[PDB]
Design a protein around this ligand. Structure first.
Ligand SMILES: [Mg+2]
Length: 128
């Protein structure tokens, strides 16, 4: 994984975005942009050059599942890695995301070490 991979962090909580950005920083990933909800994220993804999306499951207007399905359906972004974030792991949520193409799932709060492990797992799973 290129340390310069461009990340999109999506969460309706500013503070949760700041945590994720700070965690990534710690790992050496400084290339991060932020979005507030699914539609905000799609707007930004339009400009191109993103490499990895970290999205919250629970967001207004367009939730994580919807954003993920829209990414998967788009010819230009369909392969982008998507890491889903939830405050509470639920079997049907996990199955629904997997089936929709999520690259992985992480329960918050999480440390830099957990994030790293999730990141490496996906890079490994996707041969990146
Ligand atoms: Mg949220």
């Amino acid at each position: 994984a290129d340390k310069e991979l461009k990340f999109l962090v999506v969460d309706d909580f500013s503070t949760m975005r700041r945590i994720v950005r700070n965690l990534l920083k710690e790992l050496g990933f400084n290339n991060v942009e932020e979005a507030e909800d699914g539609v905000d994220a799609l707007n930004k993804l339009q400009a191109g050059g993103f490499g990895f999306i970290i999205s919250d499951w629970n967001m207004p207007n367009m939730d994580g599942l919807e954003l993920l399905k829209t990414i998967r359906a788009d010819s230009a972004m369909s392969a982008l890695p998507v890491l889903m974030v939830t405050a509470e792991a639920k079997k049907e949520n996990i199955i629904a995301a997997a089936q929709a193409g999520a690259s992985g799932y992480v329960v918050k709060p999480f440390t830099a070490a957990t994030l790293e492990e999730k990141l490496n797992k996906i890079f490994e799973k996707l041969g990146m």
